[PDB]
Design a protein around this ligand. Structure first.
Ligand code: A1BSU
Ligand code: ZN
Length: 139
């Protein structure tokens, strides 16, 4: 669990989206595992606009923040799950680090702000769905 709250938007994992996220849908992309919904209150998270490859993420299965080097956003194959069939997920970044299924939603940050959120993992790896390209989140 976990979300990004910026202005009148809430960015969540598409597979974890609630009824209210769909009843107030702005944009959703199953290939990126992202869903953005509208909010009644103003959010205050700052989104980063950069090409950073180092940052810190929150791991709820360890109650700990961890520093990571991560890859540039790209198409990476993700094995079949109860949410999606076997496919390439786009705009995905990998790092060496611990993650478990309940870790989706944890924020990845750098000195410029919010980079993305935990979306995939396993075998000593962790995947993050990038949001730095969604320039509309700020306007
Ligand atoms: C069950 O495999 C894992 C093992 C450790 C950590 C994790 S992060 C939950 C996972 N989960 C995944 O990578 N999945 C399942 C959840 C949806 C993900 C997607 N982007 O389609 C793919
Ligand atoms: Zn940055």
């Amino acid at each position: 669990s976990g979300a990004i709250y910026v202005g009148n938007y809430r960015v969540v994992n598409r597979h974890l989206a609630t009824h209210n996220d769909w009843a107030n849908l702005v944009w959703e992309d199953s290939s990126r595992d992202l869903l953005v919904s509208s909010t009644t209150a103003q959010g205050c998270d700052t989104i980063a606009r950069c090409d950073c490859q180092t940052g810190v993420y929150y791991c709820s299965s360890r109650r700990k923040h961890y520093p990571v080097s991560f890859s540039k956003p790209s198409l990476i194959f993700v094995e079949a799950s109860e949410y999606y069939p076997a496919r390439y997920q786009s705009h995905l970044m990998l790092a060496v680090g611990h993650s478990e299924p309940g870790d989706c939603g944890g924020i990845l940050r750098c000195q410029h702000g919010v980079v993305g959120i935990v979306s995939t993992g396993g075998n000593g790896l962790v995947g993050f769905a990038d949001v730095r390209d969604l320039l509309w989140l700020d306007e």
